[PDB]
DNA sequence: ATTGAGGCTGGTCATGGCGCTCATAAATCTGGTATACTTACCCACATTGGGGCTGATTCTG
């Protein structure tokens, strides 16, 4: 739910993008892995107050 | 500057705990009726306004 009124489910997103649900899942997992890769999001890691 | 393989782009098949929906049920929430006789509670100032006089110009017997 980023920069929009509401979020969209994975199936509606796949339908809008003409991409299967599993391919959408794999692309999301690749994006999450790339964000978990180091040398990035250092301020995001610093955003924890514990 | 080609043709022989690895990494990575397309989709397969269910899969699995989660959430919305149906139904049961005792606890919680509402309305109702009692026929010996019981009858009235328990500080000091300053200002404006209302009501009772107080003359003072108009009229009277």
């Amino acid at each position: 739910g980023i920069d929009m009124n509401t979020d969209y489910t994975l199936e509606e997103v796949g339908k809008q993008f003409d991409v299967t649900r599993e391919r959408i899942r794999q692309i999301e997992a690749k994006a999450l892995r790339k964000l978990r890769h180091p040398s990035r999001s250092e301020v995001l890691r610093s955003f924890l107050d514990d």
Side-chain angles (χ1 to χ4, degrees):
Chain A
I2 292 179
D3 216 358
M4 273 184 294
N5 292 317
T6 175
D7 55 341
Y8 293 102
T9 182
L10 190 137
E11 154 68 42
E12 183 169 22
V13 168
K15 192 255 306 206
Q16 216 274 327
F17 284 164
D18 207 74
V19 175
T20 58
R21 287 206 312 273
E22 178 80 49
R23 185 56 198 165
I24 287 298
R25 213 208 64 96
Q26 292 200 10
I27 295 163
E28 214 205 296
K30 290 191 287 292
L32 263 294
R33 186 176 63 250
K34 170 191 289 181
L35 292 187
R36 260 81 153 265
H37 175 272
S39 71
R40 208 205 292 247
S41 69
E42 188 262 332
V43 53
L44 267 299
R45 271 103 168 101
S46 299
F47 266 117
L48 312 176
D49 49 343
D50 39 359

